[PDB]
Inverse folding.
DNA sequence: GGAGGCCAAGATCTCAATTTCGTACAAGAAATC
DNA sequence: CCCTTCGGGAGGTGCATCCCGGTCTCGCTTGGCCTCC
C-alpha cells in the first residue's frame, strides 16, 4: 500500500535475452527480486509484498507491469543469437581424484559422452540480443529501482543458471499515461481472455511466478516487441 | 604520471594490476571528479526556491537523452534527479540525425 | 536464510578468453557479444558458474576425502549428479512440479546440489556475467605460427639422423605441394562463393554440392600426405580475450541461504583462488583472475543492502572480510551430517 | 602435485620484438597490442611458451643423451611431438573424450608433454603474456637503410674486375629505372588507395582488382630486371620493440605440477638462461632478457600461498633460492622412468 | 555362457564477414611534520 | 654615472623485399564384436 506512479524502466541488455514463449513480464522479475530480498520462496507472501511496490489490478487479477519490449537503437537492433549451455567434462572432472570409475582389468571405463544419460548436453536456446530492454509498470520507483539494481534478476529464462539477459544501467522515467495493461486495446502483458484485450492466445498463470498455479487461458503481446529507444524515451 | 606512479605503488605493494588498468582507474576517478565539479557548477544555478535557471551545456559530449549508451553517460547524473524530466525533454542545439526507421 | 549478493570486480591477470560456438564463426574466434561486432563482449556467466561448480565439487571431494582404499566414494552417478546435475541411473527424487520450496531434505543433506541445482531442483546460486567496464577492454590475443622447429634452430638438425633428415625433407616437400594444391582448391571454392551471389537457382542445386566435393577433394589431398596429415607451418588464428587488467563488473548471488550452503560457496571461492582460472587457452595462462566481491545481504523486510564483508581473491592470498562470512565458513566446516552420496 | 605460480618480471637487456601476423598490417610493423590500436603492446605468451618448449625439448634431448656422432635416439616424429605437440605419424594416442585419467600414463612417462600438453591433452604449463610496466617502454627500433657497399666506401671497388664494375653500373641503372617506373605505378596505386574510402561495395571490388593488377604490374616490372630482382638500396622498415631495460610483468602457472614435471620446467628455464632470447630480429641481438620469478605454490583450501623459492636469470648466472626448487630439479634429474619415446 | 565396454555406421545440410582513436584544471585554507 | 650592435644564408637524392601456411570435434543411438564376471 503506497502511492504508485506510471514508470517506464529502460535498461541496457548485456547478454542475450531468452524468452520462454511468453514475453518476460516485469512482475516476474520483481517477484524473483523480492523472493531474494525477503528470503522466502512462498508465493503468497512474496506476492503480498509485491503489491506494496506494484499496482495490482483486482478486477483483472494482473499486476500493472507490462511485458518485455526491446528498445532498439539505430546502431544496434534486435538480433537472433543462441544461448548455448554445453557440458564441459574436463580431464580434471574425468579423473579418479573426484570419483571411482568402474574398473575392468585396471582400465577405467570411459564415460560415454557421445550419447546416453551421461552425454555432453549441448543445449541451444533461442535468445534475442537487443541494445535495450524496456518495461512499463505502475508502481513505486524507489523499490523497483533498488530491486532491479541490486537483486540478482535478469530478463528472460533462468537468469540464475544461464546468466541470460543480464542488465545494468537501469533508468526509470515517469510516464504520463498508464501503458502497463492496455494500449489502444492491444494487451501489453499476459491478461485474461475475458478482459476484451486482443493479442496472442496462450496458456499461463496471470500473476507470478509463471511456473506454478493453474495455467488459464490468457492474451499476451507478441513475445518479441521492438520500439525505437527514441520513441520509448519520448514518454 | 599519477597513473604511472600509482602503478608503482600497486607494483611495490605487491598488487598485480597492469599500467593500463591504473590508467583506467585514474581516468574513472578523474571523471568522477568532473561529475562532482559539474554538479557544483549546476548547483550555482539554483540557490533559492524561486530561482529559475536556463542551463546551457554547450559541450558536445554531454549525453543526449536518447543516447543511453553514450560514453560519458555518468555525466547525466549532473542534473538533479528532480529535474531529470526536463533533461529528457530538452532543446538540442546541434542534435544528430534521427529517422523513421521502419524496423521500429 | 539470507540472500547473499556478491557484487564485485574481476581484474584480469592474464587475458580472459572463452570459446562459444555461436560467437565463433569462420571469420574468426570472437567472444559472446550480444549484438554486432561493435557491441561490447561479455564473459559468459555460464563459464564462471561451471568453473565455480567444479571448485565446489572439488571442495566437497576434499571434505569427504578418500575411502580406506584410496578411491573417491563417489561413483559415476553421484559424480555426475554433483558435477552437472544429470541423473544417469534415473534414481533421483523427482520432486512434484508445483511446490517451489521442494527438496528441503536434499538441500540440507547435499549443499552442493543446493547451491548449484540438479535436474528438477532449482539451484540457489545465480552466477552472473563478468561485464567489462570499458570500451576497449578486449583484443585478439594469442595468434602466431607453429614454426617448423628445424627451420628456426639449425642446431636441432645436428640431433636428427640422416634417415630422419630425409624424412624431414620429404615432410616439407609434401607439406609445400599439398598446401599449394589446397590453395588452388580454396581459390576455386572462393570463386564459387563469389558466383553464389549471382545465383539464379538453376545452378545452386549443383553449386553447393560442387563446393562440398571440393572440400572432399581437400580432405583427400590432406589424406594423401604420407608423412604428415596436417601442415606444421600453420599461422595460428587469434582468439578474442579480455585485456590484461580488465575490470569486469561481476554480479553473483546465492538465494536464501542456510549458513552451510553459503559456507560451501565461500570454500569453493577459496579453492578457486588456488587456480583462479576462467575460460580456456590455459596454454597461454589465460583466465587468471583476481576479484574483489563485496558480499551484501538484504535487511530482514527492508529493501536495503547491508554489507556483511568482502571476498578479495588475489595472487597473494584470499582475504575473507567480515565476521559473518567466517561464521558461514565455520558452519560449513562443522555440520558434518552432509550426505553427498545416494 | 602442486600448482606452481611463477610471478615475476622480465627486464630487457636488448630490445624485445615479435612479428605476429594478426597485429602487423600494411601501415608498418606493430607489436601485438593489449586490445586496441592505442593499447600497451604486450609480448605474446605464445612466443615465450614456444621458446620455453624448445628449451625443454633440448633439455630432454641432452638428458636422454647423444649418440657417438651426436644424434638423439628420438626420431623426427618424437621431436615434433615434444617441441610442437604435432603427431606426424598419427600414431599419438588420441584420448577419446570421457576417458578417465586421460593421459595419466603418458603424463607420468612423458613429463615434457605433461607440461606443454598436446592435442586433446591439457598442458599443465600456462605461459602468460608479458605486459610492460609503465607508459612508453616501446619504440620503433631497427630501421635504417641497406646501402650500396661501393657507394659508401670506394675502397671496396679496387677488388672488382672491369666486367664486375660494369655489372654494378648495369645494376644501378636498372635499379634507378625500375624505381622510377615502380614509383609511378605505386603513385597510381596510392591514388586508388585513397579512392577506397568511397567504398561502394561494387566499386570497392573493381578498385581492389585494379590494385591487384597494379601489384602484378609491379611484380612484372621487377621480373624484367636482368641484374637485380630487388632494389639493393632501400630503407628498412622499423620494427616495434620493447626498449632495452623494459620491465615486463610475467605470470606463468604449472597446474598440478608433480615434482618431476616442475623440475623439468625449472631445468628448461635454466637452459633457456644460456641463450635467454625471446622473439625475433636476433640479427640485432633482440630478445635478450634477464627475468626473475618468484615461485609460489597454493595448497587448495588454504587462504594464502607459500613461496617455494625464486628463479633469477641474469647474464651472470641463474640464481635459484629456496630448497624446494632444488629438490624438484633433483627429482626430475634422478628419475629414470620417462619414456619420452613415442609408444 | 551372460554383461559390460570400444568402435563404426547411419540421410543430407545449413549460413550471416566490424575494420582503431577518452580525458586537456581551478585554488580553498594553515602555527606543517 | 654611461650602454648592450646590426645579417646572412638554411640542400641537393636515393630507395621502401622476397614467403610461408590457416587442424583435428562434438554434443546420438545402436548393435557387432571383444573381452571379463
Amino acid at each position: 500500500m503506497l502511492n504508485f506512479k506510471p514508470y517506464r524502466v529502460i535498461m541496457s541488455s548485456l547478454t542475450p535475452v531468452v524468452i520462454s514463449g511468453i514475453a518476460p513480464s516485469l512482475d516476474g522479475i520483481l517477484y524473483e527480486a523480492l523472493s531474494q530480498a525477503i528470503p522466502s520462496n512462498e508465493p503468497g507472501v512474496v506476492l503480498a509484498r509485491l503489491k506494496e511496490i506494484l499496482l495490482f489490478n483486482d478486477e483483472l487479477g494482473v499486476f500493472h507491469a507490462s511485458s518485455l519490449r526491446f528498445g532498439i537503437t539505430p546502431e544496434q537492433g534486435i538480433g537472433a543469437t543462441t544461448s548455448m549451455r554445453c557440458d564441459y567434462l574436463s580431464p580434471e572432472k574425468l579423473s579418479t581424484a573426484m570419483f571411482s570409475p568402474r574398473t575392468r582389468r585396471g582400465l577405467f571405463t570411459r564415460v560415454l559422452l557421445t550419447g546416453g544419460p551421461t552425454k555432453r548436453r549441448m543445449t541451444t536456446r533461442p535468445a534475442y540480443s537487443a541494445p535495450y530492454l524496456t518495461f512499463d509498470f505502475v508502481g513505486s520507483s524507489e523499490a523497483v529501482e533498488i530491486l532491479l539494481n541490486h537483486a540478482h534478476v535478469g530478463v528472460g529464462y533462468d537468469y540464475f543458471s544461464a546468466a541470460n539477459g543480464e542488465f545494468n544501467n537501469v533508468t526509470i522515467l515517469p510516464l504520463d499515461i498508464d501503458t502497463s495493461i492496455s494500449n489502444e486495446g492491444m494487451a501489453l502483458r499476459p491478461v485474461p481472455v475475458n478482459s476484451g484485450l486482443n493479442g496472442i492466445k496462450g496458456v499461463s498463470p496471470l500473476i507470478p511466478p509463471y511456473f506454478v498455479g493453474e495455467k488459464l487461458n490468457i492474451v499476451h503481446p507478441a513475445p518479441v516487441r521492438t520500439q525505437l529507444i527514441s520513441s520509448l524515451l519520448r514518454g | 604520471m599519477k597513473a604511472e606512479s600509482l602503478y608503482g605503488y600497486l607494483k611495490e605493494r605487491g598488487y598485480s594490476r597492469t599500467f593500463e588498468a591504473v590508467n583506467r582507474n585514474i581516468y574513472l576517478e578523474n571523471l568522477r571528479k568532473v561529475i562532482r565539479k559539474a554538479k557544483q557548477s549546476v548547483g550555482r544555478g539554483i540557490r533559492s526556491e524561486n530561482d529559475t535557471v536556463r542551463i546551457i551545456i554547450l559541450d558536445p559530449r554531454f549525453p543526449e537523452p536518447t543516447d543511453l549508451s553514450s560514453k560519458h553517460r555518468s555525466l547525466e547524473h549532473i542534473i538533479p534527479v528532480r529535474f531529470r524530466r526536463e533533461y529528457r525533454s530538452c532543446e538540442i542545439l546541434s542534435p544528430a540525425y534521427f529517422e523513421e526507421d521502419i524496423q521500429c | 536464510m539470507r540472500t547473499l549478493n556478491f557484487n564485485g570486480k574481476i581484474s584480469t591477470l592474464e587475458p580472459l578468453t572463452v570459446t562459444v560456438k555461436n560467437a565463433v564463426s569462420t571469420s574468426g574466434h570472437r567472444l559472446p557479444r550480444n549484438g554486432g561486432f561493435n557491441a561490447a563482449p561479455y564473459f559468459p556467466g555460464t563459464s564462471i558458474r561451471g568453473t565455480l561448480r567444479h571448485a565446489a565439487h572439488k571442495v566437497i571431494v576434499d571434505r569427504v576425502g578418500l575411502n580406506a582404499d584410496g578411491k573417491s566414494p563417489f561413483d559415476l552417478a553421484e559424480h555426475f549428479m554433483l558435477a552437472q546435475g544429470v541423473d544417469i541411473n534415473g534414481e533421483a527424487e523427482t520432486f512434484a512440479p508445483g511446490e517451489i520450496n521442494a527438496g528441503a531434505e536434499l538441500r540440507s543433506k547435499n549443499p552442493l546440489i543446493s547451491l548449484f541445482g540438479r535436474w528438477g531442483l532449482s539451484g540457489k546460486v545465480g552466477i552472473g556475467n563478468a561485464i567489462p567496464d570499458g570500451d576497449n577492454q578486449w583484443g585478439m590475443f594469442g595468434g602466431g605460427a607453429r614454426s617448423i622447429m628445424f627451420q628456426r634452430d639449425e642446431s636441432l638438425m645436428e640431433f636428427l639422423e640422416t634417415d630422419q633428415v630425409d624424412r624431414l625433407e620429404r615432410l616439407l616437400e609434401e607439406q609445400a605441394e599439398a598446401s599449394v594444391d589446397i590453395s588452388q582448391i580454396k581459390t576455386e571454392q572462393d570463386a564459387l562463393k563469389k558466383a553464389m551471389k549471382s545465383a539464379d537457382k538453376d545452378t545452386k542445386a549443383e553449386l553447393q554440392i560442387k563446393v562440398r566435393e571440393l572440400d572432399e577433394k581437400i580432405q583427400a589431398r590432406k589424406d594423401q600426405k604420407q608423412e604428415s596429415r596436417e601442415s606444421i607451418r600453420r599461422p595460428i588464428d587469434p582468439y578474442e580475450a579480455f585485456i590484461t587488467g580488465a575490470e569486469l563488473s561481476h554480479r553473483m548471488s546465492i538465494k536464501n541461504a542456510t549458513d552451510e550452503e553459503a559456507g560451501l560457496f565461500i570454500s569453493a571461492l577459496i579453492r578457486f583462488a588456488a587456480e583462479p582460472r576462467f575460460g580456456g587457452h590455459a596454454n597461454h595462462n589465460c583466465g587468471l583472475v583476481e576479484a574483489h566481491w563485496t558480499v551484501t545481504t538484504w535487511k530482514p523486510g527492508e529493501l536495503v543492502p547491508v554489507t556483511l564483508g568482502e571476498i578479495v581473491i588475489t595472487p597473494n592470498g584470499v582475504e575473507i572480510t567480515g565476521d559473518e562470512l567466517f561464521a558461514m565458513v565455520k558452519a560449513f566446516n562443522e555440520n558434518q551430517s552432509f550426505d553427498f552420496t545416494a
